């Protein structure tokens, strides 16, 4: 059908189907996912974990502790779940990857103009660097552009999905390493088939209506 | 297929004047913004939609500066969207969303209505009190609706450019958000491509999945 269909159908999905797999198609589809969604100058500042193993997701489920119960089962039971990661600092070496890698696709014509995309980014990267000393927070905002972009991205391929901030982030970083690599866990995606456990698939969507939240000017 | 506009969407940089969103794009992109997920529904967002000249006009004042390239695209769209995040996470918010789940039939015990408030006001409480970061954490929320919206208009066949280089304290002040307890943070023109556009007909780069992607 249309995404409008599918926006106002998807849901947040409090119990999977372990048995309910991604087809092997799906599986690549929701990478290219993750790697083509937009950022602020193209900046990608990003990690993924994806996890399809029992093994995997286990490691994955020793964030869901403590106060934080309530996600374990979700972690666990999901065909594959994604931890979406920011980067902690943004660094000159990955500022010239970025650059490099739309060299080598083909984006810019002249030698002049990959100088003019370097400098392009450098005004917005050394404004949160080095100004307004938010580059932690900057950079995370892109990784929840990318969460929002996947969450209805995998909702059109016919996924059921749920997006968790209910994790320990120090937990998860320090089971992948995630700190020394340069990077830090923000949001858990499950991804797979909701069970008939999951009392939200019959539950009316719920939102704030357009005249509290929208202006037309 | 979701996967063919995912990787035929592109950021565009000059707009046609004369391609105007129809009625029913109109309507089906508030329905985006309105039903975009949040942490526990939280919902911490304002938007503004400039569909008339003058509009678009007030919103161009936002990129004078350091950021005239950027007005052009702003004025020549069909209708422009301000992406705003609350300032502060207060009670009034909160129980305004809880009796919106409410209205629309989403608990079936006052108890569970209850449950619902308290598992909200504990993550809304932590990060106030404990974390230091309620702005940003609804920033994030905010953030996660622009990347909602924009593969939403690219399925709908409409292209778009999501902005970071505007001035957020001239636009906080020509629509007066401060005062109103909200903060700008993208802004996205949706429309169609003119003729002159460079980046439609250029390849999109990305990073390698062996730099940022770890199965295990
Ligand atoms: C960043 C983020 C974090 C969330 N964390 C959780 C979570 O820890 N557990 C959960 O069950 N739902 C979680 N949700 C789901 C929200 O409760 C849900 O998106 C919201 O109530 C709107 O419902 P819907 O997604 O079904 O439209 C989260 C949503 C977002 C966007
Ligand atoms: C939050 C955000 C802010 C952006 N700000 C600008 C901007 O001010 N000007 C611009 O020309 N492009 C801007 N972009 C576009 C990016 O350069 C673009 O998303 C990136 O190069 C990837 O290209 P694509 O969107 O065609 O896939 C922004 C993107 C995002 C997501
Ligand atoms: O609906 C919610 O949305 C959230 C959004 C952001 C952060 C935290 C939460 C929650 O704790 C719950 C409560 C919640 C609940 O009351 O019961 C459940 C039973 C099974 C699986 C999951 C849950 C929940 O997440």
Redesign the pocket.
Known sequence: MDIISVALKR??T?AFDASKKLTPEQAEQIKTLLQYSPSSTNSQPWHFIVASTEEGKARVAKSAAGNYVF?ERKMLDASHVVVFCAKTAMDDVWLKLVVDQEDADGRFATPEAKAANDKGRKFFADMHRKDLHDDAEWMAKQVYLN?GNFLLGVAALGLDA?????FDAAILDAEFGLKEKGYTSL?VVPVGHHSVEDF?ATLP?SRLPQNITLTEV
């Open positions: 849901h947040s409090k996600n969460v749920v997006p968790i901030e209910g949001v939200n969507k």
